[PDB]
Amino acid sequence: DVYAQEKQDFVQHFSQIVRVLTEDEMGHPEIGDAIARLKEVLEYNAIGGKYNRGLTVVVAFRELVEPRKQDADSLQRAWTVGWCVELLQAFFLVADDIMDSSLTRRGQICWYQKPGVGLDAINDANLLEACIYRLLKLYCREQPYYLNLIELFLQSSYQTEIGQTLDLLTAPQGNVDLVRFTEKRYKSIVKYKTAFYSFYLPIAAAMYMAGIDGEKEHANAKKILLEMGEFFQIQDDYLDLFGDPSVTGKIGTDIQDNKCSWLVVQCLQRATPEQYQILKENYGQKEAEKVARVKALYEELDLPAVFLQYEEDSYSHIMALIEQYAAPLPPAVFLGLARKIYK
């Protein structure tokens, strides 16, 4: 209902993102070709998403301002920062898909896989990163929050990259790494790699855009948004395998990439010594017979219905945290976020 509303409005505003970010032509005719390529990047990589995070910034902003203070220019900034989160996202997936060897994403071939692109993808990725802060200076350079956002976006990139380093240290190509797959490792991973940016960031951004910068208020918010954070990825890793690729818009590479997924983690808790051995022979390998034998094993331990279980268990716990912790904020923020991620 509530994201469903302002989505289209959120997406039209992407025409101006691109306009502004590439309005340097007669001033710098030399670099016009870099700026075209830039456009081409943004069109391809910032678009197709569920735009949930970018939206989340916008919805949160409305919710947290007295509409007597939501003037035209405040909403200008409101969805600008929205778009910045989308860029951040886009930055991450473009790099992520080289690193994770992915084939497709958002219903089309990965940027880095297009012929004529390949590893220029890396430079492209960091460009999106840059555009984030380019906008900030544009639309927020004179706000009292301008600096808090910059630090937020960065403090959040770092955290994402720390997560990403764990992801990979825990998931070497070649090395049977079942010992490494503990739930203690896992919670750490999705915390840094997912929760902070896909949740704390967007919300937090708007908190600062609403003049709300108390450490304790941010801390509570954080407490809540790291769970939603966390479930979200267990759902990502679930969908990776049992999800519909015409609906996820991507193909899963978790078994092949020897990844510390929720699944392999639970699988291990419930392994008969023999089973441990089947998985051992099969996990972390390109071969489809092996990837298949594992998918069977996950089904052989009825993990999909276990995921259905945690989904309820977590919905219920996330909801307790909202009650315990939302205030002084309007609980519609978090609720709106939960509706949009639970099934």
- What are the residues binding its own copies (CB under 8 A)? 30-31, 33-35, 37-38, 95, 98-99, 116, 118-120, 122-127, 129-130, 133-134, 137, 147, 150-151, 154, 157-158, 161-166, 168-169, 172-173, 184-185, 188, 191-192
Q: Is residue 307 close enough to count as binding ligand 1MV by CB under 6 A?
A: no
What's the rounded Cα separation, in Å, for the pair 283 and 241?
13
DSSP 157-186: HHHHHHHHHHHHHT--SSS--STT--HHHH
Percent helix, strand and coil across the chain, each to the nearest 5: 75, 0, 25
Residues 6 or more apart in contact with residue 251 via CB below 8 angstroms: 102, 103, 104, 245
From the list 19, 50, 187, 286, the catalytic residue is 50
In the chain, where do the E strands start and end?
104-105, 108-109
From the list 97, 100, 124, 257, the catalytic residue is 100
Nearest to 192 by CA among 219, 163, 231, 171: 163
* Binding partner of 33, given ligand 1MV, Mg ion, its own copies, none, CB within 5-8 angstroms per partner class: its own copies
Residue 302 appears among annotated catalytic residues? no
The least distance separating Mg ion from the CB of residue 261, rounded to whole angstroms, comes to 8
From residue 180 to residue 219, the character string flagging contacts with ligand 1MV as x (rule: CB under 6 A) and all else as - is: -------------xx-------------------------
The least distance separating ligand 1MV from the CB of residue 330, rounded to whole angstroms, comes to 27
143 annotated as belonging to a binding site for a ligand:
no
Residue 236 appears among annotated catalytic residues? yes
Tokens 């919710």 belong to residue: 63
Q: Which amino acid is at 56?
A: T
From the list 191, 193, 222, 290, the catalytic residue is 193
* Binding partner of 119, given Mg ion, its own copies, ligand 1MV, none, CB within 5-8 angstroms per partner class: its own copies
- The dihedrals phi and psi of 271, each to the nearest 5 degrees, come to -95, 130
Please give the annotated binding residues, written as ranges: 50, 53, 89, 96, 100, 105-106, 193-194, 233, 250, 259
